[PDB]
Amino acid sequence: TSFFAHTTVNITIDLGMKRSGYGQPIASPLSNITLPMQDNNTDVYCIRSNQFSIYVHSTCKSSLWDNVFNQDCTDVLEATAVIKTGTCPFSFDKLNNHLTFNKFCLSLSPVGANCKFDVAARTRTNEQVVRSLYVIYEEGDNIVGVP
Amino acid sequence: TAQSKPWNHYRLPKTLIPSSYNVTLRPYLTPNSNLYTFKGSSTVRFTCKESTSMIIIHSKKLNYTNIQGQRVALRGVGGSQAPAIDRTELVEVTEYLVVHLREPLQVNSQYEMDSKFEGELADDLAGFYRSEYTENGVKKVLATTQMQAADARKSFPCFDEPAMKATFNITLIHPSNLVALSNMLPRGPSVPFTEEPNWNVTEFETTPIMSTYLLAYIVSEFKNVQENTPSNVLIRIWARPSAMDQGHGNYALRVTGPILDFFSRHYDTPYPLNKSDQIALPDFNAGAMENWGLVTYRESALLYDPQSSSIGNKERVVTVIAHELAHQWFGNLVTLEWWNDLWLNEGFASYVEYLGADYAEPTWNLKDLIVLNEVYRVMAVDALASSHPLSSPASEVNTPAQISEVFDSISYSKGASVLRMLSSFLTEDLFKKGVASYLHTFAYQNTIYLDLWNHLQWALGNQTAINLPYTVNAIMDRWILQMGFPVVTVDTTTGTLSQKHFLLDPQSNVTRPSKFNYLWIIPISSVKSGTQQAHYWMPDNAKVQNDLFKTTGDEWVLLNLNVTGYYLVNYDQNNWKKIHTQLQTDLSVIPVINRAQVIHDTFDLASAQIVPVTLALNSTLFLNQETEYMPWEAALSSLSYFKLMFDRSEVYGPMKNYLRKQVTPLFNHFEKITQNWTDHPQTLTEQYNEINAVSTACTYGVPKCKDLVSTLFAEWRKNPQNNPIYPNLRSTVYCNAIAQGGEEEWNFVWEQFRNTSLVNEADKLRSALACSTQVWILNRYLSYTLNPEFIRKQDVISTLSSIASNVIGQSLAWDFIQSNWKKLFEDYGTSFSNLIQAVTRRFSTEFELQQLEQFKANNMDTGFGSGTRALEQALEKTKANIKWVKENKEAVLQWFRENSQGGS
Numbered sequence A: 001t002s003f004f005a006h007t008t009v010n011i012t013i014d015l016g017m018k019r020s021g022y023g024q025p026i027a028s029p030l031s032n033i034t035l036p037m038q039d040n041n042t043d044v045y046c047i048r049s050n051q052f053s054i055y056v057h058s059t060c061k062s063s064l065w066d067n068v069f070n071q072d073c074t075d076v077l078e079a080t081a082v083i084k085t086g087t088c089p090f091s092f093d094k095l096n097n098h099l100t101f102n103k104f105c106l107s108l109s110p111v112g113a114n115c116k117f118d119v120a121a122r123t124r125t126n127e128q129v130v131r132s133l134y135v136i137y138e139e140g141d142n143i144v145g146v147p
Numbered sequence B: 001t002a003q004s005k006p007w008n009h010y011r012l013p014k015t016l017i018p019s020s021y022n023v024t025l026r027p028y029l030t031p032n033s034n035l036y037t038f039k040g041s042s043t044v045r046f047t048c049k050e051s052t053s054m055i056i057i058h059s060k061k062l063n064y065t066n067i068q069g070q071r072v073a074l075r076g077v078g079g080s081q082a083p084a085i086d087r088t089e090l091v092e093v094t095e096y097l098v099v100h101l102r103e104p105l106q107v108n109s110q111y112e113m114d115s116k117f118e119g120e121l122a123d124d125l126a127g128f129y130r131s132e133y134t135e136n137g138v139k140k141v142l143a144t145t146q147m148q149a150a151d152a153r154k155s156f157p158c159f160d161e162p163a164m165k166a167t168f169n170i171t172l173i174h175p176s177n178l179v180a181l182s183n184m185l186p187r188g189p190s191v192p193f194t195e196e197p198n199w200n201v202t203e204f205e206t207t208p209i210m211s212t213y214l215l216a217y218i219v220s221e222f223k224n225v226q227e228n229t230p231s232n233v234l235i236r237i238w239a240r241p242s243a244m245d246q247g248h249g250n251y252a253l254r255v256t257g258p259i260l261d262f263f264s265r266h267y268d269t270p271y272p273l274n275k276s277d278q279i280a281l282p283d284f285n286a287g288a289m290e291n292w293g294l295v296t297y298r299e300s301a302l303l304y305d306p307q308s309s310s311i312g313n314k315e316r317v318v319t320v321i322a323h324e325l326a327h328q329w330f331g332n333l334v335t336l337e338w339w340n341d342l343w344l345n346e347g348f349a350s351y352v353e354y355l356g357a358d359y360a361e362p363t364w365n366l367k368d369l370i371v372l373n374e375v376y377r378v379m380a381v382d383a384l385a386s387s388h389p390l391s392s393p394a395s396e397v398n399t400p401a402q403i404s405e406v407f408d409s410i411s412y413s414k415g416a417s418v419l420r421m422l423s424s425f426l427t428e429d430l431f432k433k434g435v436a437s438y439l440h441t442f443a444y445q446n447t448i449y450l451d452l453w454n455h456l457q458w459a460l461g462n463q464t465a466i467n468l469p470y471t472v473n474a475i476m477d478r479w480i481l482q483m484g485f486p487v488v489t490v491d492t493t494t495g496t497l498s499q500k501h502f503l504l505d506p507q508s509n510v511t512r513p514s515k516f517n518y519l520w521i522i523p524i525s526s527v528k529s530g531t532q533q534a535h536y537w538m539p540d541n542a543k544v545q546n547d548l549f550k551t552t553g554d555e556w557v558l559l560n561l562n563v564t565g566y567y568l569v570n571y572d573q574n575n576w577k578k579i580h581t582q583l584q585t586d587l588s589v590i591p592v593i594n595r596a597q598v599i600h601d602t603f604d605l606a607s608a609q610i611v612p613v614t615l616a617l618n619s620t621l622f623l624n625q626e627t628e629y630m631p632w633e634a635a636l637s638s639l640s641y642f643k644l645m646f647d648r649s650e651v652y653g654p655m656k657n658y659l660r661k662q663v664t665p666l667f668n669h670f671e672k673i674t675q676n677w678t679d680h681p682q683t684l685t686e687q688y689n690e691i692n693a694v695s696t697a698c699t700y701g702v703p704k705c706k707d708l709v710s711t712l713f714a715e716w717r718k719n720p721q722n723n724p725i726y727p728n729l730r731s732t733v734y735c736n737a738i739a740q741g742g743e744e745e746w747n748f749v750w751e752q753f754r755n756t757s758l759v760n761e762a763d764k765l766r767s768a769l770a771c772s773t774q775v776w777i778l779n780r781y782l783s784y785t786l787n788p789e790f791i792r793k794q795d796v797i798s799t800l801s802s803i804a805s806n807v808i809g810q811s812l813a814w815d816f817i818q819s820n821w822k823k824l825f826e827d828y829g830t831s832f833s834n835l836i837q838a839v840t841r842r843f844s845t846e847f848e849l850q851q852l853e854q855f856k857a858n859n860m861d862t863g864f865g866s867g868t869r870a871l872e873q874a875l876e877k878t879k880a881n882i883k884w885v886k887e888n889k890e891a892v893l894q895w896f897r898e899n900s901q902g903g904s
């Protein structure tokens, strides 16, 4: 546990895709964001290092009427997570750019959320918002991030 | 005289009243060299109330092993010396065993009667019977019991009258491989039968005082899903091993617990027993029986497959569980002296089933579908001169056959409709208090309907808030002692209400007499321009006046709010229009159940020629702004006859275009809320209107609906094993896909039909194959019927009546039934009536009537068997159909053409 270190935060966003009645790609809200585990808790991860890096791992799955994602996406259904800026003054890309913040915590719960990023699924045809990722930020220079 | 003799009278003599029974039965589930058989041995203890020289007890189909001289042996409890048995005789018609004694019995002295007997464990669905089932190719047979009414005497000699309640000690000698169940839990663990060690002996605890018709004993290799309630009651759901392994009876376990709890608090009476065994039997025609602690059900009414079953099945299981569990208090704890009053037991449960099911699934709002499923269902039959009063004199119900006639829609649905109206004026909390008062005072006893009224009146006396203008007895006497229901016509200009017996035929010959001259005391809740008015009580008088119903200007009145009462409502033309303009200006003002009323009532009044057919069709105009199920179903049900008579006529184009314009908004509504038919709704009512939206939009030519069917069916043809279509929309998509396509589509569904194991899916696919637009495909499908390797025997009548529903198949099927009549009669005449009703349902011309008449003459030597009444009925319907078309074709055409653009 050293403040002066590089912590890589891997945002694993399992994506749930369901085929529509007209064959269109429809993005289920049941898709799940898995933040790195901290304090025996996957719900919230607070950066405790001078240098951080936020990376997104995206997996596509398919369900049918059941809502059980038992298979892999094929054809129109296949898509890749794209974390849209949403209600924030900074993009997910700006964070991994030269951006400085005293405190940065990503939480799946809207409690204390100073801001909220919109996680979406980008099919070749369209990008549809699925879940929302909340961010609690404190302006400062103690912590900064880069590739 | 011989007629006077007590053994030649169907009703039991009240000289001997039984105390308790000791019944030991051994089901032999292996065939005899010649018949499955059961062996029994019973001992009843009775007290003589009036000195008699003969013991008259019920015995049906029981061979008796003679003990000493005669069939029975008589002993005496206390110092009672038992008289000697001179002779024993068996009357077969009245189902009695007459034991003639040499010396008379003594008043208030107790006696005991032993008997050893044997009977046939036949597949009669009556008494101790065998239910045969095939599991994985192995034919397994189980022993179960339906004792309703006369059947208990078939299994053991007993006084089979509901008023003669007793405690029973049931012992079962069964194979060790099979399980033993009864009304109560076993006294101890099963102990092997000493004489034959391949058998076990389960002796059950002593039953509470109860009627012989609520007894049950089942020996089967079934499996269970257990769960102990917070109230310390054991809930077990029993079913075939295959079904329990697939977890089909888990929804039943999820709801049974909450339902018993609700009724415990509602009736303020703790569950009488400690166990609620609920078994699902393969072949159970009865549907369900309220046996106390061993409720037997049909597999379709207890088991729910979440991967294949539609939401319709989820409604059937939760409501039927709520009905048979309500009986455990109202009907089993406090039973009724005779079947003349069966309506109260079944009617009350048929009303409180929706209450209990709402507790289990509160998101569904099931307490509102009682109007649609029970009231509107029974009004169609109660509006005929052939209907019957809810209550008849107890002297009129004697024959076992006369007892079975009490089990009908009037007793169940109109019973519930009359008891829902009571719980409306009485305020429900008072109604609950009276029912609780009744179950506490008359527990473990028998009752008269007066006994419930008395308690519900006393509840009003212990209150000062609710004050009724008449007694509960009198108000309800008008609805239980006379047949039919009233139509309330309100002239809003003068405020004059009128009541008249509503009969759907314009010309009808009511010959049945009434003491109240067909005039009812009607509770009338009303609304004046959206705001609820004071409650009204219209007397048993033809016409009366009250300024509550006197409108001025834009003021409109709407009566029977929520359809609490059992009556039809008619207003003056002006008020109807003001209601119709409100349904267009803004409908939320008028409640959903009353929005269905303005449709059901107007169409029913039009059938009676009280209002023009144009008013009925006018009520279907607000449906372009309606997303609710009840208002839409009430129209689609009434407009089914219009389609049946006009689907092959000049006026179907206008009809289709009107219903297309009115269903287009509904289809687009669900398209939006379901994200292009991906995420389906979660409320029963909404899921039902989605099926109605999809099916209706399609059979009326909505372009998008045809694209949804094509897409869903396309994805299914690829990856056949995993089916994309939602269990609820499968039937519509299947039928449409077959009609929209040709041989390739038909050959697919046929292959899947011949590969499916689930009867649920098989029937959907089989009924879909009848939707083909190809004449040669339909005729081939009709020839598949003749061979039982392609279509099961029991599926033949439903296959033929499905082909007959296709406009192209009506001619093809009528021809097929005429040419193959002998074969069909020789198999289904012994069900067939319904075939001659499905076909001949569209008959509406003089030329079709002539064909039907010529066919009768031609096939007189063969005969019409069960449907002999139906062939005559079809002639009378066709003649009545010819009249309707002649008097309404022009008006219907003009209206549809004028309102083709939909509504504003």
Ligand SMILES: *[C@@H]1O[C@H](CO)[C@@H](O[C@@H]2O[C@H](CO)[C@@H](O[C@@H]3O[C@H](CO[C@H]4O[C@H](CO)[C@@H](O)[C@H](O)[C@@H]4O)[C@@H](O)[C@H](O[C@H]4O[C@H](CO[C@H]5O[C@H](CO)[C@@H](O)[C@H](O)[C@@H]5O)[C@@H](O)[C@H](O)[C@@H]4O)[C@@H]3O)[C@H](O)[C@H]2NC(C)=O)[C@H](O)[C@H]1NC(C)=O
Pocket: B020, B021, B022, B043, B044, B045, B077, B078, B079, B080, B168, B169, B206
């Ligand atoms: C199905 O199973 C149920 C049980 O699950 C059976 O119910 C039982 O029925 C028997 C017979 O009626 C009952 O046995 C008798 O009960 C008498 C009263 O017992 C009660 O009071 C006691 C206090 O007084 C109390 O302690 C006890 O718990 C219970 O509450 C009891 O007195 C009897 O025992 C004596 O009497 C016997 C016979 O009566 C004598 O007296 C008369 C009158 O003078 C005389 O004519 C007769 O000849 C006798 O002398 C005698 O045989 C005994 O030796 C003893 O003196 C006896 O226990 C039993 O209590 C019931 N059990 C339950 C739980 O209800 C039911 O009968 C059965 N069905 C059938 C068809 O049998």
Ligand SMILES: *[C@@H]1O[C@H](CO[C@@H]2O[C@@H](C)[C@@H](O)[C@@H](O)[C@@H]2O)[C@@H](O[C@@H]2O[C@H](CO)[C@@H](O[C@@H]3O[C@H](CO[C@H]4O[C@H](CO)[C@@H](O)[C@H](O)[C@@H]4O)[C@@H](O)[C@H](O[C@H]4O[C@H](CO)[C@@H](O)[C@H](O)[C@@H]4O)[C@@H]3O)[C@H](O)[C@H]2NC(C)=O)[C@H](O)[C@H]1NC(C)=O
Pocket: A020, A022, A024, A025, B675, B676, B704, B707, B708
């Ligand atoms: C849920 O379903 C909606 C309807 O789905 C359509 O109908 C069903 C039965 C299927 O056939 C399905 O495949 C159809 O898509 C759907 O709304 C529809 O979405 C599509 C795709 O976005 C729209 O297509 C686009 O239309 C515009 C033109 O709009 C005008 O014309 C249409 C009729 O064609 C009218 O309905 C509109 O009111 C307008 O008058 C086209 O310009 C566009 O193509 C253009 O762009 C592409 C790419 O650059 C070029 O290649 C083309 O040359 C064009 O330049 C599309 O064709 C469709 O209009 C729209 N309909 C409606 C009524 O909204 C919705 O998107 C689905 N939503 C979900 C939950 O996924």
Ligand SMILES: *[C@@H]1O[C@H](CO)[C@@H](O[C@@H]2O[C@H](CO)[C@@H](O[C@@H]3O[C@H](CO[C@H]4O[C@H](CO)[C@@H](O)[C@H](O)[C@@H]4O)[C@@H](O)[C@H](O[C@H]4O[C@H](CO)[C@@H](O)[C@H](O)[C@@H]4O)[C@@H]3O)[C@H](O)[C@H]2NC(C)=O)[C@H](O)[C@H]1NC(C)=O
Pocket: A014, A015, A016, A017, A030, A031, A032, A061, A066, A067, A068, A069
């Ligand atoms: C995102 O993560 C969520 C959890 O937050 C995942 O949803 C879960 O999915 C699993 C299956 O992968 C579900 O477990 C399954 O339950 C099915 C029946 O339960 C139904 O009802 C519950 C309660 O409402 C729902 O949660 C569930 O989705 C169903 O609607 C079973 O049929 C499944 O069967 C599997 O296990 C059995 C043994 O138990 C095997 O025999 C089967 O073959 C099969 O393996 C399974 O048990 C779990 O209940 C879901 N929880 C939810 C919805 O919160 C999503 O999958 C995930 N989404 C992604 C990946 O995008």
Ligand SMILES: *[C@@H]1O[C@H](CO)[C@@H](O[C@@H]2O[C@H](CO)[C@@H](O[C@@H]3O[C@H](CO[C@H]4O[C@H](CO)[C@@H](O)[C@H](O)[C@@H]4O)[C@@H](O)[C@H](O[C@H]4O[C@H](CO)[C@@H](O)[C@H](O)[C@@H]4O)[C@@H]3O)[C@H](O)[C@H]2NC(C)=O)[C@H](O)[C@H]1NC(C)=O
Pocket: B368, B561, B562, B591
């Ligand atoms: C004719 O029939 C209609 C329909 O049954 C009756 O109208 C209903 O009245 C009941 C009264 O109990 C309503 O139930 C209550 O609804 C409240 C919310 O009202 C509305 O808003 C929600 C959200 O939009 C809608 O979903 C809902 O349908 C209503 O439109 C709730 O707040 C109430 O909760 C209270 O009671 C429960 C009891 O379990 C408690 O647990 C709660 O804590 C709280 O105390 C309640 O659920 C019902 O919703 C009404 N339906 C509609 C659509 O109007 C008429 O009253 C009836 N009229 C006559 C003449 O009999």
Ligand SMILES: *[C@@H]1O[C@H](CO[C@@H]2O[C@@H](C)[C@@H](O)[C@@H](O)[C@@H]2O)[C@@H](O[C@@H]2O[C@H](CO)[C@@H](O[C@@H]3O[C@H](CO[C@H]4O[C@H](CO)[C@@H](O)[C@H](O)[C@@H]4O)[C@@H](O)[C@H](O)[C@@H]3O)[C@H](O)[C@H]2NC(C)=O)[C@H](O)[C@H]1NC(C)=O
Pocket: A008, A009, A010, A036, A055, A056, A057
């Ligand atoms: C966070 O997630 C990263 C992966 O994230 C990816 O990479 C970053 C840079 C971003 O671009 C993201 O968008 C990407 O999604 C994990 O990194 C992986 O760690 C695993 C740990 O097992 C590594 O697996 C190893 O693979 C070795 C083979 O390749 C490597 O070694 C060979 C020589 O042996 C070398 O030629 C090659 O260049 C690699 O260095 C294998 O030998 C070794 O035994 C092991 O299996 C994997 O290589 C890493 N991938 C990358 C690209 O980082 C982090 O582990 C994870 N950490 C946290 C804290 O969340």
Ligand SMILES: *[C@@H]1O[C@H](CO[C@@H]2O[C@@H](C)[C@@H](O)[C@@H](O)[C@@H]2O)[C@@H](O[C@@H]2O[C@H](CO)[C@@H](O[C@@H]3O[C@H](CO[C@H]4O[C@H](CO)[C@@H](O)[C@H](O)[C@@H]4O)[C@@H](O)[C@H](O)[C@@H]3O)[C@H](O)[C@H]2NC(C)=O)[C@H](O)[C@H]1NC(C)=O
Pocket: B436, B437, B438, B440, B441, B457, B458, B459, B460, B461, B462
């Ligand atoms: C209020 O309601 C009670 C009945 O409900 C009870 O009280 C309420 C508050 C709740 O606690 C319920 O759970 C209770 O069940 C009415 O009581 C009845 O009153 C009538 C008289 O108006 C009684 O009838 C009389 O009965 C006499 C014999 O009584 C005995 O025998 C009966 C059985 O036959 C038995 O039930 C009772 O307990 C006695 O052992 C008889 O001599 C007399 O001529 C007459 O027939 C009736 O018995 C009472 N029933 C009960 C169960 O109490 C109140 O009258 C009512 N108040 C008002 C003002 O209406």
Ligand SMILES: *[C@@H]1O[C@H](CO)[C@@H](O[C@@H]2O[C@H](CO)[C@@H](O[C@@H]3O[C@H](CO)[C@H](O)[C@H](O[C@H]4O[C@H](CO)[C@@H](O)[C@H](O)[C@@H]4O)[C@H]3O)[C@H](O)[C@H]2NC(C)=O)[C@H](O)[C@H]1NC(C)=O
Pocket: B022, B043, B169, B203
């Ligand atoms: C109807 O069915 C009920 C059961 O459902 C029968 O009631 C039972 O009767 C038996 C026999 O009398 C009872 O068993 C006896 O219990 C007593 C008291 O505890 C003694 O323990 C008895 O043992 C002595 O007597 C036997 C026989 O002579 C002897 O072998 C032994 O060595 C002892 O001397 C014991 O057998 C049983 O508890 C009763 N159960 C209940 C719950 O009541 C009832 O008899 C049946 N009636 C008829 C007419 O068939």
Ligand SMILES: *[C@@H]1O[C@H](CO)[C@@H](O[C@@H]2O[C@H](CO)[C@@H](O[C@@H]3O[C@H](CO)[C@@H](O)[C@H](O)[C@@H]3O)[C@H](O)[C@H]2NC(C)=O)[C@H](O)[C@H]1NC(C)=O
Pocket: B175, B176, B177, B178, B179, B180, B189, B190, B191, B192, B200
């Ligand atoms: C028929 O009666 C016999 C005898 O009561 C039943 O045998 C019983 O079988 C059950 C299991 O199904 C036994 O439970 C287990 O017993 C063993 C002791 O060997 C113990 O280790 C476990 O804790 C458990 O209790 C039960 O004891 C056994 N009783 C015996 C052998 O006396 C048989 O199952 C019965 N079948 C039916 C349908 O009645």
Ligand SMILES: *[C@@H]1O[C@H](CO)[C@@H](O[C@@H]2O[C@H](CO)[C@@H](O[C@@H]3O[C@H](CO)[C@@H](O)[C@H](O)[C@@H]3O)[C@H](O)[C@H]2NC(C)=O)[C@H](O)[C@H]1NC(C)=O
Pocket: B720, B721, B751, B752, B755
């Ligand atoms: C008629 O019904 C039977 C029984 O459902 C169908 O048999 C099934 O055939 C499918 C396709 O071959 C089997 O799927 C399998 O999936 C596994 C992976 O999960 C894969 O490893 C296998 O190679 C195979 O693709 C399925 O196991 C099999 N089930 C059984 C019990 O036989 C048959 O295909 C149906 N024919 C139709 C739909 O016309």
Ligand SMILES: *[C@@H]1O[C@H](CO)[C@@H](O[C@@H]2O[C@H](CO)[C@@H](O)[C@H](O)[C@H]2NC(C)=O)[C@H](O)[C@H]1NC(C)=O
Pocket: B034, B037, B038, B063, B118, B119, B120
């Ligand atoms: C009960 O007894 C009747 C006879 O009283 C049995 O019926 C007979 O069955 C045998 C064997 O099939 C036939 O040969 C006789 O002709 C039958 N006689 C009558 C009058 O039916 C009946 O099978 C017995 N039932 C049981 C289960 O014991």
Ligand SMILES: *[C@@H]1O[C@H](CO)[C@@H](O[C@@H]2O[C@H](CO)[C@@H](O)[C@H](O)[C@H]2NC(C)=O)[C@H](O)[C@H]1NC(C)=O
Pocket: B573, B576, B612, B614, B615, B618
């Ligand atoms: C059905 O509703 C239509 C209106 O939608 C009624 O037609 C009106 O009838 C009145 C009285 O004759 C005329 O003054 C109006 O001009 C008519 N309006 C239209 C648009 O036709 C019709 O009377 C209603 N029929 C019934 C029996 O209720």
Ligand SMILES: *[C@@H]1O[C@H](CO)[C@@H](O)[C@H](O)[C@H]1NC(C)=O
Pocket: B184, B185, B205, B273, B274
């Ligand atoms: C049911 O439970 C009660 C206690 O609430 C008990 O007295 C009675 O004997 C039990 N009957 C059984 C076990 O069937």
Ligand SMILES: *[C@@H]1O[C@H](CO)[C@@H](O)[C@H](O)[C@H]1NC(C)=O
Pocket: B508, B509, B511
């Ligand atoms: C009504 O029935 C009676 C008795 O059968 C009969 O005399 C009378 O003619 C019938 N009237 C009509 C209108 O059918």
